[PDB]
Amino acid sequence: RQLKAAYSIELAQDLRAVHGMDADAELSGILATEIMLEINREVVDWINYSAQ
Amino acid sequence: STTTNSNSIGRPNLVALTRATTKLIYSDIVATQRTNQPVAAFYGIKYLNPDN
């Protein structure tokens, strides 16, 4: 499983300013968390899939 | 009679470089002040008469 993300440099500046959060870490904090949720869903999904 | 024509020159000496840069005038023509937001706002405060 894999995922990608595309953030512009100027967005990193604006997000670092104004609000005050690093634009880079959020996408890493989103993609990695999202993938783990899907796998954690797939394990649950298979159980109901295979249940009698 | 061995003249200078018999001898062969080597790498010519590099006496001088020559770059071309304009006499940039913008630190003197305008008033500069760095902004910490992507949108910069100027306040115009004016004094009026009863006739505005």
UniProtKB/Swiss-Prot annotation, chain A:
Post-translational modification: A proteolytic cleavage by the prohead core protein protease gives rise to the mature major capsid protein during virus maturation.
Organism superkingdom: Viruses
Described purpose of this protein according to its UniProt entry: Major capsid protein that self-associates to form hexamers, building most of the capsid in association with pentons made of the capsid vertex protein and one dodecamer of the portal protein. The major capsid protein self-associates to form 160 hexamers, building most of the T=13 laevo capsid. Folding of major capsid protein requires the assistance of two chaperones, the host chaperone groL acting with the phage encoded gp23-specific chaperone, gp31. The capsid also contains two nonessential outer capsid proteins, Hoc and Soc, which decorate the capsid surface.
Subunit description: Homohexamer. Interacts with the portal protein. Interacts with the capsid vertex protein that forms pentamers. Interacts with hoc; one hoc molecule associates with each capsid hexamer. Interacts with soc; this interaction reinforces the capsid structure. A total of 960 subunits of the major capsid protein forms the 160 hexamers.
Record-stated family: Belongs to the Tevenvirinae major capsid protein family.
Official protein name in the record: Major capsid protein
Organism: Enterobacteria phage T4 (Bacteriophage T4)
Encoding gene per record: gp23
From Swiss-Prot, chain B:
Post-translational modification: Proteolytic cleavage at the N-terminus by the prohead core protein protease gives rise to the mature capsid vertex protein.
Subunit description: Homopentamer. Interacts with the portal protein. Interacts with the major capsid protein that forms 160 hexamers.
Function text: Capsid protein that self-associates to form pentons, building the capsid in association with hexamers of the major capsid protein and one dodecamer of the portal protein. The capsid vertex protein self-associates to form 11 pentons, building the T=13 laevo capsid in association with 160 hexamers of the major capsid protein.
Record-given protein name: Capsid vertex protein
Family: Belongs to the Tevenvirinae capsid vertex family.
